[PDB]
């Protein structure tokens, strides 16, 4: 299912990117709800945790798609899956950077990146 895998990974990543940028913003107005020092602040924090949770869920499913990719796996698929792990480690790194404001969401970013670095060295040792 060699090239259908490249299709699903790229398009799912597009969805992740869209959901993540949408997410960044919902935070930014939460963070503009800062310097409030109320209902908006609470309902946005409420919408805050919603979006973050759903993004984490989708990335965890993509992390499962990554393990599917690795158990199924030549150089052009090695480089292509490298792109997936690379921007996946990038997007959740950014998520952590935001989660560090932390009104949970960050450790979920952690455990996902823990699977990421596990998969990364696991592939690097054989691809070398």
């Amino acid at each position: 299912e060699i090239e259908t895998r490249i299709l699903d990974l790229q398009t799912a990543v597009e969805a992740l990117v869209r959901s993540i940028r949408q997410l960044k913003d919902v935070q930014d107005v939460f963070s503009f709800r800062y310097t409030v020092l109320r209902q908006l602040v609470q309902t946005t924090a409420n919408e805050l945790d919603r979006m973050r949770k759903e993004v984490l869920d989708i990335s965890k499913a993509l992390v499962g798609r990554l393990t599917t990719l690795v158990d199924l796996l030549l150089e052009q698929w090695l480089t292509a899956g490298a792109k997936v792990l690379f921007h996946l480690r990038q997007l959740l790194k950014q998520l952590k950077d935001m989660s560090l404001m932390l009104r949970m969401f960050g450790q979920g970013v952690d455990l996902q990146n823990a699977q990421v670095t596990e998969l990364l060295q696991r592939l690097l040792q054989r691809s070398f």
Partner: protein, 400 residues
């Protein structure tokens, strides 16, 4: 390694020279630092007169010329190198485009209607349409773009934000109009109002002789916040509170501005205007780092030219002495060639040609890597690559 001494792969061709290598290498080694805290051209001049040489004097000035030229490369022409002036410009560009993207994105969904339409006056496609310039990423650095954004920003505020502070700012215009018609100046009677951000005077310390910056007329800064903002601006052009260590804590309250808004005003509208105030301060911070890039640029060039002028000025005495007494060919060659190198801003090619021309000039083993490496061991007890890395100083290669 062998290049750990002053004479590196492209390094200066003794105890003071090792400190110069420690200066140039610390630039890259440090995980991150403020480019403005790094020495400027004035301090480069300061060190240049303090160099230590040990046994011609013309060769010593010619070696200090390589110091300054390699220094300039790392400080300015080193795009994407550790803590460089252009690197700040490009990173800011990305923050700017993205901020206006956020403003265009405003109104995508519940994330934050005609009131929104007045807010999208900031969008680059609108501002380019009014000046008539084609929509272009580079256009933000044009002076006219900054001028046009001001009129739109204060068009926004007078339509949606009618508060007390902004109230005073609008009254000011009515009174100013009357006072200009009779050929007079606005008096100091009404100083009861808190100081407006524009009235503040700040001065960049990297290039102190740049003159007082014309603070952008960003609004809604509280008197206390106005101090912190102006404080950071004077120190490191906001580098500290936007990149580097602990940037996340400042990021909690905004990239170019503190998160701030007036009370009793719809927050949905407030965030919109706040994006405009941020983009307005972004455009300022771009044009300023551009100016400090240019004032290091000009200064570096001038210094190099002055130095090389002294080089041919002194080595000609060595030519007459050797005549009274191949090496004569090499010396006159670089004399004429250094003059040919006008270092016209190309600029990297001339600089690299310079050091290559100095490399072609013969030097005693006392000045070559042999002794340099030996001296390194005791203490312990090229231009081609530069030419490739050096990118065009023109803005819209940096913006790309």
């Amino acid at each position: 390694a062998r290049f750990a001494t002053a004479n590196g792969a492209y390094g200066i061709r003794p105890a003071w020279d090792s400190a110069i290598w420690g200066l140039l290498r610390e630039v890259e080694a440090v995980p991150y630092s403020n480019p403005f805290t790094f020495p400027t051209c004035e301090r480069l001049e300061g060190i240049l007169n303090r160099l230590e040489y040990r046994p011609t004097d013309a060769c010593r000035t010619l070696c200090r010329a390589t110091v300054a030229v390699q220094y300039a490369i790392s400080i300015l022409y080193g795009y994407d190198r550790s803590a460089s002036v252009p690197r700040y410009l490009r990173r800011l560009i990305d923050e700017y485009i993205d901020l206006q993207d956020r403003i265009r994105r405003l109104g995508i969904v519940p994330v934050l209607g005609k009131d929104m339409n007045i807010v999208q006056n900031v969008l680059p496609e609108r501002v380019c349409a009014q000046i008539g310039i084609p929509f272009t990423y580079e256009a933000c650095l044009l002076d006219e773009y900054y001028d046009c954004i001001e009129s739109n920003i204060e068009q926004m505020y007078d339509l949606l934000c009618m508060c007390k502070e902004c109230g005073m700012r609008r009254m000011e215009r009515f009174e100013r109009v009357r006072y200009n018609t009779i050929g007079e100046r606005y008096p100091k009677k009404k100083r009861d109002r808190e100081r407006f951000f524009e009235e503040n005077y700040v001065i960049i310390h990297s290039h102190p002789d740049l003159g007082v910056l014309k603070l952008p007329k960003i609004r809604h800064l509280n008197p206390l916040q106005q101090l912190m903002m102006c404080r950071y601006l004077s120190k490191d052009l906001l580098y500290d509170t936007q990149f580097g260590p602990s940037n996340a804590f400042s990021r909690a309250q905004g990239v170019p501005l503190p998160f701030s808004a007036v009370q009793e005003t719809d927050m949905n509208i407030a965030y919109a205007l706040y994006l405009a105030s941020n983009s307005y301060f972004m455009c300022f911070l771009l044009r300023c780092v551009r100016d400090v890039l240019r004032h290091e640029e000009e200064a570096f060039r001038k210094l190099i030219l002055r130095l090389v002028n002294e080089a041919v000025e002194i080595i000609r005495d060595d030519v007459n002495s050797r005549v009274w007494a191949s090496a004569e060919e090499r010396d006159l060659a670089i004399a004429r060639s250094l003059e040919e190198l006008t270092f016209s801003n190309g600029f990297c090619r001339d600089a690299a040609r310079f050091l290559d021309l100095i490399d072609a000039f013969h030097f005693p083993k006392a000045l070559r890597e042999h002794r340099a490496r030996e001296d390194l061991l005791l203490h312990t007890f090229d231009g081609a690559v530069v030419r490739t890395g050096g990118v065009n100083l023109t803005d819209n290669e940096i913006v790309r």
